[PDB]
Amino acid sequence: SVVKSEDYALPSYVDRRDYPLPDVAHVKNLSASQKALKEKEKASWSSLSIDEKVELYRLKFKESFAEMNRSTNEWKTVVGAAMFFIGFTALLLIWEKHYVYGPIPHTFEEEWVAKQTKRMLDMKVAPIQGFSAKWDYDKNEWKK
Amino acid sequence: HETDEEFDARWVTYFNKPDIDAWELRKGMNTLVGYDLVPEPKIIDAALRACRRLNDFASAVRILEVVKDKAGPHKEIYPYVIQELRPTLNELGISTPEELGLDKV
Amino acid sequence: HYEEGPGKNIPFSVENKWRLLAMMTLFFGSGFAAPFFIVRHQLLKK
Amino acid sequence: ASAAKGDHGGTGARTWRFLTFGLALPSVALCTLNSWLHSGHRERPAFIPYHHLRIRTKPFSWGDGNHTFFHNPRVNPLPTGYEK
Amino acid sequence: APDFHDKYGNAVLASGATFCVAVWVYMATQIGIEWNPSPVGRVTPKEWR
Amino acid sequence: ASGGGVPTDEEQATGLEREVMLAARKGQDPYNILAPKATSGTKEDPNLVPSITNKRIVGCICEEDNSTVIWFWLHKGEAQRCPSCGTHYKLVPHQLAH
Amino acid sequence: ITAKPAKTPTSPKEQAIGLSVTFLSFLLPAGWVLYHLDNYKKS
Amino acid sequence: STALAKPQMRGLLARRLRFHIVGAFMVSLGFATFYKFAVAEKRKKAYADFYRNYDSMKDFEEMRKAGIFQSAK
Amino acid sequence: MFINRWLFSTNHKDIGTLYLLFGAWAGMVGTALSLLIRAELGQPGTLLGDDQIYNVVVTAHAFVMIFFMVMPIMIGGFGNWLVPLMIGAPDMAFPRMNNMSFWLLPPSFLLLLASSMVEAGAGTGWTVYPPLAGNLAHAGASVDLTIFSLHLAGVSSILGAINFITTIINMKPPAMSQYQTPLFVWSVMITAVLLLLSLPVLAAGITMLLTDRNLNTTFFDPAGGGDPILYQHLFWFFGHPEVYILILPGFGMISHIVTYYSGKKEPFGYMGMVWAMMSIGFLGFIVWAHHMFTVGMDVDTRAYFTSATMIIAIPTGVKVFSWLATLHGGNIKWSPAMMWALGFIFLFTVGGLTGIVLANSSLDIVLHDTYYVVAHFHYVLSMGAVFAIMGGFVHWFPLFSGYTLNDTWAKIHFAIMFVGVNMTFFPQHFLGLSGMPRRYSDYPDAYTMWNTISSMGSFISLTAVMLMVFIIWEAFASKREVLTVDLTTTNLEWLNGCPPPYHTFEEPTYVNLK
Amino acid sequence: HQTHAYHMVNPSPWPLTGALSALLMTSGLTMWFHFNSMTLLMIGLTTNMLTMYQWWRDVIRESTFQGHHTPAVQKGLRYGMILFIISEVLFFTGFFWAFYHSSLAPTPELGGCWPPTGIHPLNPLEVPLLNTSVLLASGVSITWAHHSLMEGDRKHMLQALFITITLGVYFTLLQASEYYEAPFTISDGVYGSTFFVATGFHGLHVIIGSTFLIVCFFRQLKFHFTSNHHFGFEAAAWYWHFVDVVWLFLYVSIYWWGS
Amino acid sequence: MAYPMQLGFQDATSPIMEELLHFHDHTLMIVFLISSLVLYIISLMLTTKLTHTSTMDAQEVETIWTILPAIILILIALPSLRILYMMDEINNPSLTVKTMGHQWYWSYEYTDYEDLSFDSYMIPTSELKPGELRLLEVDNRVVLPMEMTIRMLVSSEDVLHSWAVPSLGLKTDAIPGRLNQTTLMSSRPGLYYGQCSEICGSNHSFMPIVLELVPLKYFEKWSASML
Amino acid sequence: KIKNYQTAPFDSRFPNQNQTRNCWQNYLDFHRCEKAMTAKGGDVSVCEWYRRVYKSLCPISWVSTWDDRRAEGTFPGKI
Amino acid sequence: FENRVAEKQKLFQEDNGLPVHLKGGATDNILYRVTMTLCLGGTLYSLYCLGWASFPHK
Numbered sequence A: 001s002v003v004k005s006e007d008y009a010l011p012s013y014v015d016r017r018d019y020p021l022p023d024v025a026h027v028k029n030l031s032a033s034q035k036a037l038k039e040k041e042k043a044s045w046s047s048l049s050i051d052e053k054v055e056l057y058r059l060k061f062k063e064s065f066a067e068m069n070r071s072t073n074e075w076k077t078v079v080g081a082a083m084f085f086i087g088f089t090a091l092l093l094i095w096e097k098h099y100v101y102g103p104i105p106h107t108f109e110e111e112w113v114a115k116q117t118k119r120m121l122d123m124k125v126a127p128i129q130g131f132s133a134k135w136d137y138d139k140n141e142w143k144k
Numbered sequence B: 001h002e003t004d005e006e007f008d009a010r011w012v013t014y015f016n017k018p019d020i021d022a023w024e025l026r027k028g029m030n031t032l033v034g035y036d037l038v039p040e041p042k043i044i045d046a047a048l049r050a051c052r053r054l055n056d057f058a059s060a061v062r063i064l065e066v067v068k069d070k071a072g073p074h075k076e077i078y079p080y081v082i083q084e085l086r087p088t089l090n091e092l093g094i095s096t097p098e099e100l101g102l103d104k105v
Numbered sequence C: 001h002y003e004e005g006p007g008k009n010i011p012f013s014v015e016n017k018w019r020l021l022a023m024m025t026l027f028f029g030s031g032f033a034a035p036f037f038i039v040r041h042q043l044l045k046k
Numbered sequence D: 001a002s003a004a005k006g007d008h009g010g011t012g013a014r015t016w017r018f019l020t021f022g023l024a025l026p027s028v029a030l031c032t033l034n035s036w037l038h039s040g041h042r043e044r045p046a047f048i049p050y051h052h053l054r055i056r057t058k059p060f061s062w063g064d065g066n067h068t069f070f071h072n073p074r075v076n077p078l079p080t081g082y083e084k
Numbered sequence E: 001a002p003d004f005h006d007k008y009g010n011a012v013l014a015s016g017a018t019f020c021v022a023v024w025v026y027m028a029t030q031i032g033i034e035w036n037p038s039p040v041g042r043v044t045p046k047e048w049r
Numbered sequence F: 001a002s003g004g005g006v007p008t009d010e011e012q013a014t015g016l017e018r019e020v021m022l023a024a025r026k027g028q029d030p031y032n033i034l035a036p037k038a039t040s041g042t043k044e045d046p047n048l049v050p051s052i053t054n055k056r057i058v059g060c061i062c063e064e065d066n067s068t069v070i071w072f073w074l075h076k077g078e079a080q081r082c083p084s085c086g087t088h089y090k091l092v093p094h095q096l097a098h
Numbered sequence G: 001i002t003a004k005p006a007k008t009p010t011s012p013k014e015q016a017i018g019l020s021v022t023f024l025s026f027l028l029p030a031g032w033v034l035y036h037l038d039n040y041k042k043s
Numbered sequence H: 001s002t003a004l005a006k007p008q009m010r011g012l013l014a015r016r017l018r019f020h021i022v023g024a025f026m027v028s029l030g031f032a033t034f035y036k037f038a039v040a041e042k043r044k045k046a047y048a049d050f051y052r053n054y055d056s057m058k059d060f061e062e063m064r065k066a067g068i069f070q071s072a073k
Numbered sequence I: 001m002f003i004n005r006w007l008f009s010t011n012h013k014d015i016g017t018l019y020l021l022f023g024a025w026a027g028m029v030g031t032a033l034s035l036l037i038r039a040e041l042g043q044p045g046t047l048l049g050d051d052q053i054y055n056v057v058v059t060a061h062a063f064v065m066i067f068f069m070v071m072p073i074m075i076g077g078f079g080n081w082l083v084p085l086m087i088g089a090p091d092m093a094f095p096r097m098n099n100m101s102f103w104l105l106p107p108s109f110l111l112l113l114a115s116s117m118v119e120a121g122a123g124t125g126w127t128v129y130p131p132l133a134g135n136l137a138h139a140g141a142s143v144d145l146t147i148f149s150l151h152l153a154g155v156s157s158i159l160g161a162i163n164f165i166t167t168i169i170n171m172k173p174p175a176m177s178q179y180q181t182p183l184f185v186w187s188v189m190i191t192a193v194l195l196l197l198s199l200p201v202l203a204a205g206i207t208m209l210l211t212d213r214n215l216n217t218t219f220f221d222p223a224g225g226g227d228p229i230l231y232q233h234l235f236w237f238f239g240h241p242e243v244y245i246l247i248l249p250g251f252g253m254i255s256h257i258v259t260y261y262s263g264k265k266e267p268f269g270y271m272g273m274v275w276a277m278m279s280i281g282f283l284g285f286i287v288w289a290h291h292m293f294t295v296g297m298d299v300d301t302r303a304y305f306t307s308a309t310m311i312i313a314i315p316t317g318v319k320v321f322s323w324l325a326t327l328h329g330g331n332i333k334w335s336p337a338m339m340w341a342l343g344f345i346f347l348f349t350v351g352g353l354t355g356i357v358l359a360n361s362s363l364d365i366v367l368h369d370t371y372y373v374v375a376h377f378h379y380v381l382s383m384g385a386v387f388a389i390m391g392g393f394v395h396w397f398p399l400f401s402g403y404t405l406n407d408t409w410a411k412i413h414f415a416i417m418f419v420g421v422n423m424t425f426f427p428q429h430f431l432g433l434s435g436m437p438r439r440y441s442d443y444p445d446a447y448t449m450w451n452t453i454s455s456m457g458s459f460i461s462l463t464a465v466m467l468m469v470f471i472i473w474e475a476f477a478s479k480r481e482v483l484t485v486d487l488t489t490t491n492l493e494w495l496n497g498c499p500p501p502y503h504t505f506e507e508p509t510y511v512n513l514k
Numbered sequence J: 001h002q003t004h005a006y007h008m009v010n011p012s013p014w015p016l017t018g019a020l021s022a023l024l025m026t027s028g029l030t031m032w033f034h035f036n037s038m039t040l041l042m043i044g045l046t047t048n049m050l051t052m053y054q055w056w057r058d059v060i061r062e063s064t065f066q067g068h069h070t071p072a073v074q075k076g077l078r079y080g081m082i083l084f085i086i087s088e089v090l091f092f093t094g095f096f097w098a099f100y101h102s103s104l105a106p107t108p109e110l111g112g113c114w115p116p117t118g119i120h121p122l123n124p125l126e127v128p129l130l131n132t133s134v135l136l137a138s139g140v141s142i143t144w145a146h147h148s149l150m151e152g153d154r155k156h157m158l159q160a161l162f163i164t165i166t167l168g169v170y171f172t173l174l175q176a177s178e179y180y181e182a183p184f185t186i187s188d189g190v191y192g193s194t195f196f197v198a199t200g201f202h203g204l205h206v207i208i209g210s211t212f213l214i215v216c217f218f219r220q221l222k223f224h225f226t227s228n229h230h231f232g233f234e235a236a237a238w239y240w241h242f243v244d245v246v247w248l249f250l251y252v253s254i255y256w257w258g259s
Numbered sequence K: 001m002a003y004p005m006q007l008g009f010q011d012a013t014s015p016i017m018e019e020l021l022h023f024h025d026h027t028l029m030i031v032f033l034i035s036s037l038v039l040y041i042i043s044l045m046l047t048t049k050l051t052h053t054s055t056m057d058a059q060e061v062e063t064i065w066t067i068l069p070a071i072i073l074i075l076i077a078l079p080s081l082r083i084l085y086m087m088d089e090i091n092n093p094s095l096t097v098k099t100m101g102h103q104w105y106w107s108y109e110y111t112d113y114e115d116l117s118f119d120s121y122m123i124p125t126s127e128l129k130p131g132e133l134r135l136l137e138v139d140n141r142v143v144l145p146m147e148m149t150i151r152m153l154v155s156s157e158d159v160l161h162s163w164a165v166p167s168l169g170l171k172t173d174a175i176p177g178r179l180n181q182t183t184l185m186s187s188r189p190g191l192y193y194g195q196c197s198e199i200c201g202s203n204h205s206f207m208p209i210v211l212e213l214v215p216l217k218y219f220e221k222w223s224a225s226m227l
Numbered sequence L: 001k002i003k004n005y006q007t008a009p010f011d012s013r014f015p016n017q018n019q020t021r022n023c024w025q026n027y028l029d030f031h032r033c034e035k036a037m038t039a040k041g042g043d044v045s046v047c048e049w050y051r052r053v054y055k056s057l058c059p060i061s062w063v064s065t066w067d068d069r070r071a072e073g074t075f076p077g078k079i
Numbered sequence M: 001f002e003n004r005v006a007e008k009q010k011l012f013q014e015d016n017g018l019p020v021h022l023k024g025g026a027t028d029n030i031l032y033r034v035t036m037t038l039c040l041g042g043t044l045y046s047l048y049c050l051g052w053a054s055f056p057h058k
């Protein structure tokens, strides 16, 4: 039953839906009852009990298809932890805004922006679609 | 290649070989489940009888699991096949994975 | 001959995980820190 | 082409030695005579300080910075003209 | 037998999402970042000349 | 016009280069320069794979022109089959340099 | 792939320690430089 | 009891593939149509309608009176 | 012992280890330069107060990421570790030369760091165009130190390309034809033939820039009858092959990772994938002047370069579709390397498509030298290369080290990196279409919002990079040794165990002809 | 014990010393061009030369003396030398490209003509024709050398190889004399730039190839070569034909067509 | 000029620029469709338990996936090359103006009749008049007649620069020793901005271009007053 | 006499984006003509077209460097 | 001259565990020590020179 490094060059056991009959049995050394069970398997399988049938399955295979195919909760740990580190990055960006960046230029002040915005509409910036197109020059207001 | 009927007969004959060995039984099933189809009952019948001649109950059950797995989300296919094999399952005393509790996760 | 095997086919020791943490910290941290320090150096020259 | 000679029964050492001394080196002798016959210094041209010549965007790393590496005073003027 | 994800997954999901949302909302809205969004529908133009 | 004085490989080749030359003379290939030719590969007439140890990697190109080669360790003992095509191989260990 | 269990398991506490030192090793020296940019800019 | 009817057992992956590649083609046609009307024609019509009765001197005169130009007051 | 092994090596695995470590340390330098770029741009105004420094940091970021991070990891690192094992060879053809190609890299890197420390750095762009890179506008040693750094990096790579071509052509089992070799070994052969023919032209070009700066030649100075545009032709004649060299070994790794995690014995359409890589490598020599559509080019020459450039989409599309047809019908294993390859396939396609928009010279007039070009190459190059690298690295790390990674932590790393790169580069498209120039230290105020979001994105990828360094530590700290690996019958590099012995294939594989 | 035919090389210090000699040569050219000093460059040229000598000495120990060049090893070296020579052809191609770009569309600073106003080109029928005859001649003698070796003739291999080396030296002295006599210089605009950088790098390869044939000459004097195994002599002959071919393109392009 | 949060191109000021907008809309539709198809197929490949892992035959499918992409490329190339040749066709300009780049400002020469030339520098942020645009305004704009084909010739007196005006679809490198030519025609009066677009050293970001498009008679008088 | 000049017309000799040689050819033609006229005691007025063309096309600094080099005797074109 | 390659073949095939670059004898060690001294000492000297060149000398 123990798999060793020094066994790498030998056929090994795998549970894969797409390779259902692996190259070796799951259990290679049998107990005396396991051995007699194998002897019993050579007679009609209708004489084997359910528990003996299950045991013959489990000597050949490690996990059933239902077991090997099961879904897990790992996605919760992945998505949660990715969110936590993304949240941590925002701490870094709060530190950089507080300690690294100085004031932005005065052209971002509310009054500058209001005047600059008028002057864009005076020169009809993007008058066909992008910007002045959205201003109503008759009603003197943004188009609804 | 060949007709459905031809393909199925070739696989029936492969598994019906009297002295098929354990290497050949595995090679067969592991090759067969590479194809885009759920094997016909007649093919599964012949591979379960090869398991009987090879004294291998465990591989017969696993062959039933793989028919179910090959059907993917088409849930009507596995009960149809088990229906079809029922005289064989009875004659050989093969219990289904469900009868053995091996469908529970 | 040379040592073979996990942990032995590499030019750094993994025999102690804390000493490895310090070596990895200094290795990757020195690459990462370098350009910050080269910008500091060029801003300090005028 | 085929050149105007012939051999081909075998291109071995005897044949390539025959080409070495019968054609290749006589050629070199003839060209050596043609050269060492149109030798003799020709009269150097008037200096004109054209801005596409005698370029100096950085001094050279040797001498006074202003002489080329195989500078020949007879025929290579400096930017300011021929040397004394 | 419960692995790490069965035991901690719901907690990791819930707190990681809460924390992430909280700290990005705070960074985006409370610390003076100027996003410079469009003036359209928001700015009253004012005489400049 | 012609003379001698240059050694021949028969006279002066040494080390492994001399070993390969002398083996080729006897039609042998101890250093694996040639591709072995397949047998029919049945259980009765398996491909014979020489080794100087107890296991050797085999690549099987199951059909001519396949681009996929199938690789596996072949161990001393009963013949083993390619996991793709079933062709048989049997290890024949030992020796080299006498 | 299958593997052995770890020869020297790294518990949650030891991972928090490894992650924190890895993070400080990149954050602190750059943080120091950038904190002091203005001391350089007019130095 | 009732026996179960025999289902399609062969080619199920190919079948699924053909169904959805056809579907993706239909959706592609849908999107081209939406896009040609929401974007591409929309643009042609914005430009066409802007220029249809456009008066460049009038636009210039409005710009001049708003004080935007160096060369015109 | 230590010095004989690690400084005098003649072993392909150790030398490949060295290149992975070198490239990883380069990638930290490169990433820190990229964070400086985006910190300067993260809000309007000046951060560094010195745009000559901002230009040096941008120039260094590209040379570090291209010559010291991608090429060493992909061809020096994965090439040396994997190509001999995938063909059953006992080492490279020239095992001691192989060690000089590695050792030329630390000196080439020291010269580039010297260039940034002396004078005011080389603030030229990684294209180093004269006259800005000439001796009046960049007087002093910095550009010359950059030129030599590229000379030593060129010779390392030209000798590596001779070694990989010879190894791949001469050292396969006698029965294995070239059409039995894995796709990664072909992707390496083809990258090496591109290196062999492209690098010598860039060495000619930058040696002429060196003589124009120091020996009073005038190849690129109109005062002597030279022409700055001649430099751009010789730079780009190398530069377009260089971008396919950066991605080709990524395409090789991706074919193996998608085959492996789809549980397939082989990629779909193997000879179509060989044809596609050879076609892309051949067309990669006849398109370079799409880097020069705004220099004053004749209309018929623009037409030809637009049409020849677009043709590359045909063979590249065959490889994208063939990777999709390889996933088709697979038993998909969602391992972290699979995630990195599927991210590659989608993000490489986005970037290749924005390349096709730029191939249209009439649209390129408006888009050239804007952030739409930066968004193009950070999708196809920065992300395609880096994601194939990360997928390779997480796939093959248990082969090279003998230890496993924590797959959950590796999934977490993937997720964070995927968010970061997309937040950083996707808005650069809007910046480009609306006309923001590249290589600027500050922008008109209208460009603030996309710049602000792109710079916040850059910090998210930084958190991913830090995490990845912890993930490697934890694997080495925990020492989970590999026991079993699936599909060795079609992945020869794993069949000698993990890590394989120092000498492998001392007895070669037996492969029959038949 | 291996049972393939390829060569596992002993761990060696020459790759590291060659990489560091590269850093010293380039550091040293920087020092010479900007910090007025030849010190680093001279140490780097000296280490470069020691590195080449010991490295190639060891390849000769490995092959002639230890027997590690089996036919598979030798075929790999043939490919390596062909791919190297292709890389050198692409390097010269950059210089021919710069030549044709400048001379086919001469700018107004030149007078809008080629050769530029004020340039008096060498007469291609004088020394340049001689140099052409000298290199073609040496291609014929090195072929005589190669056949004498394959035919097992020691004295005539030595004489033909000597003659070939004497021709290489004669071309080098000729070209040195032409450079001194030339009335234009490397600073004479793009005419001087293309002429001296393209012929100067060719001249450097003539010196390297001559040095390589001189090493083959001393190896042949010590009986290293056999009549069937002599790859260093084949590599030196393929390199020498490369140098001859590059010269033919220089002569036609620069000296003849560009005059 | 660009405006905050803009996603696409500046509105077109010249009829070449409107052509490019329609061509970009056609190309972008094709780019979205392909990228969204590959993302969709990826999700489809990954969302079934059905398997098929045996060797698959590739020659039928490689036909569709080489011919369909070839047709899509020809469907981009055709309108693409139509625009290219249309822009190139003989125009007859009524005016030639030269611009020379320098580190770091532009100069302009209008010498068809008189000798008019001047330099044009960015307005420093601290000197901007209320409402003016940071990094974009200049002291001396390039005044030009609207509704007229103008030939711009572009060069440099020092390193490379590039003279760009995105709303007019223009970008032409400025190379010392070369005189590159491009044509400009504005459908509208107004102020059109652009920025130097080839890295030329430490103030590459700070040498903008501003065109001021006005009726010809204003342009004549402005020219006279700039002598 | 044949005037109303607005700007230099399209010249099929120089149809592409680089107009350096158009500027240069008209500068040379002007000065060659003016040389021909001043010599053969005719009138420079006939050289006008080339003068207008090279003025419209050539950068002022090119014209001014080339005039200096003609005065200096180092102008490399033939006049 | 006489052919003495067989003597050299014996020398370099001596089973003494020496790597090929030192197997000719003491003279190899001395050449190796000269080369490596010059390379390492030159490399330290080039780092000094970078240190010197990294700062303005006004």
Ligand SMILES: CCCCCCCCCCCCCCCCCC(=O)OCC(COC(=O)CCCCCCCCCCCCCCCCC)OC(=O)CCCCCCCCCCCCCCCCC
Pocket: I350, I353, I354, I422, I423, I426, I427, I429, I430, I433, I453, K007, K008, K009, K028, K031, K032, K035, K036, K039
């Ligand atoms: C990061 C912040 C982004 C801010 C978003 C927009 C703001 C809206 C303002 C407010 C909306 C108001 C309406 C104003 C209309 C302006 C019209 C215009 O002139 O139009 C020109 C515009 C048109 O742009 C748009 O019409 C916006 C659509 C954005 C493209 C769709 C992908 C959505 C991406 C998701 C977020 C980004 C990160 C993930 C992207 C992942 C990689 C693409 O500009 C472009 O050319 C950008 C596209 C660059 C080309 C690269 C294409 C590759 C495809 C991408 C993947 C798609 C398949 C997967 C489908 C998507 C699955 C992920």
Ligand code: HEA
Pocket: I243, I244, I246, I247, I290, I291, I309, I310, I312, I313, I316, I317, I318, I320, I348, I349, I350, I351, I352, I353, I354, I355, I356, I358, I359, I360, I364, I367, I368, I369, I373, I376, I377, I380, I381, I382, I384, I385, K034, K038, K068, K069, K070, K072, K073
């Ligand atoms: C990995 C590196 C890499 C790769 C592979 C590519 C690939 C391509 N790139 Fe480029 N590119 C860069 C790196 C790369 N690029 C860099 C670094 C620059 C800037 C250099 C500098 O200035 O600094 C650049 C610049 C660049 C420019 C110059 C822009 C400018 O400066 O104005 C152009 C112009 O055509 C271009 C085009 C392309 C094209 C058409 C491809 C094609 O090979 C892409 C092919 C892929 C697809 C099209 C997607 C997959 C296909 C399908 C799904 C099939 C169906 C598709 C269609 C029918 C369209 N790239």
Ligand SMILES: CCCCC/C=C\C/C=C\C/C=C/C/C=C\CCCC(=O)O[C@H](COC(=O)CCCCCCCCCCCCCCCCC)COP(=O)(O)OCCN
Pocket: D068, D069, D070, D071, D072, D076, I151, I152, I154, I155, I203, I207, I210, I211, I215, J029, J172, J175, J176, J179, J180, J181, J182, J183, J184, J185, J186, J187, J196, J197, J199, J200, J201, J203, J204
């Ligand atoms: C007889 C033919 C022999 C050729 C060799 C002779 C000279 C010195 C050695 C080095 C050879 C290098 C090759 C070519 C490099 C550049 C120019 C050399 C050709 C030459 O020698 O040109 C001489 C100028 O030399 C000069 O500047 C000499 C400057 C010498 C410094 C060389 C500078 C080093 C720069 C080379 C960098 C090399 C990068 C290599 C890339 C490797 C690939 C990665 C011409 O002399 P002149 O007085 O101008 O005119 C003659 C007037 N009577």
Ligand SMILES: CCCCCC/C=C/CCCCCCCCCC(=O)O[C@H](COC(=O)CCCCCCCCCCCCCCC)COP(=O)(O)OC[C@@H](O)CO
Pocket: F012, F013, J052, J056, J057, J059, J060, J063, J064, J069, J077, J081, J207, J208, J209, J211, J212, J215, J224, J225, J226, J229, J230, J231, J232, J233, J235
């Ligand atoms: C003033 C002088 C200094 C000039 C500066 C530059 C220096 C000059 C270098 C000249 C090159 C000398 C090369 C000598 C190689 C000797 C080793 C050798 O030739 O090795 C041979 C293998 O070839 C091999 O490695 C082939 C190895 C081939 C090497 C080819 C090298 C060309 C080098 C060019 C370097 C410069 C690059 C150009 C700049 C742009 C050994 O095999 P055989 O010959 O078959 O012998 C075995 C038989 O005896 C068995 O019976």
Ligand SMILES: CCCCCCCCCCO[C@@H]1O[C@H](CO)[C@@H](O[C@H]2O[C@H](CO)[C@@H](O)[C@H](O)[C@@H]2O)[C@@H](O)[C@H]1O
Pocket: A092, A095, A096, A099, G027, G028, G029, G030, G031, G032, G034, G035, I035, I036, I039
């Ligand atoms: C782009 C990569 C950068 C990412 C963001 C980096 C995130 C920052 C991590 C913190 O870095 C540190 O923070 C300080 C403050 O928070 C500094 O202390 C400074 O601040 C003090 C308090 O104001 C003093 O106590 C000290 O002297 C000191 O220099 C400082 O040295 C530094 O190491």
Ligand code: CUA
Pocket: K101, K102, K103, K104, K160, K161, K162, K196, K197, K198, K199, K200, K201, K203, K204, K205, K207
């Ligand atoms: Cu001028 Cu950039």
Ligand SMILES: [Cu+2]
Pocket: I239, I240, I243, I287, I288, I290, I291
């Ligand atoms: Cu390109």
Ligand SMILES: [Mg+2]
Pocket: I294, I368, I369, K162, K197, K198, K199
């Ligand atoms: Mg540009």
Ligand code: NA
Pocket: I040, I041, I042, I043, I044, I045, I046, I047, I441, I442, I443
């Ligand atoms: Na900034």
Ligand SMILES: [Zn+2]
Pocket: F060, F061, F062, F070, F082, F083, F084, F085, F086, F087
């Ligand atoms: Zn087989």
